[PDB]
Amino acid sequence: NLYFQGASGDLYEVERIVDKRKNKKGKWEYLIRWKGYGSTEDTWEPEHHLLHCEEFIDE
Template sequence: MVNISCVKPYKGPLPGQHVDRPGLVVVTQEGEEEFEVEQVVDARFKRGKLEFLVLRKGYGDKDRMWEPKPHLDNSCDAVREFDSKSPSAPRKLRGMDLNLFEP
């Protein structure tokens, strides 16, 4: 329940105030949301699985998220670019090459 006497009209951002607007969200046939990756920022292993820190298109730095590698199947170019700029970043586990995006 909302007390209507406390509701104020929306007036928009203040002059000069930066506003992050979310990027396009694609809904897959499975009903899952899919975001476009602007840049892969970092990589790590968590619980034995490779994850990438991604910056999503239309979002700010504070909204970066760790995503498991299988979630980036549609972002091969961003992963390749990160791999070429960060050759010492994690990408192997127990001798198995996890860089599945190479041709």
């Protein structure tokens, strides 16, 4: 359950990671299949704007 976090702060739901690449600054980017969109809308996003979420367990 992945999400992209915008500069605005908002969270956008990710269907899946399509691909991965290293950028010119040596940092990882992921090709994002956005939930509700098709492959023509896939975009490369920086790793540090991606989040993984899980059901809350009081642990």
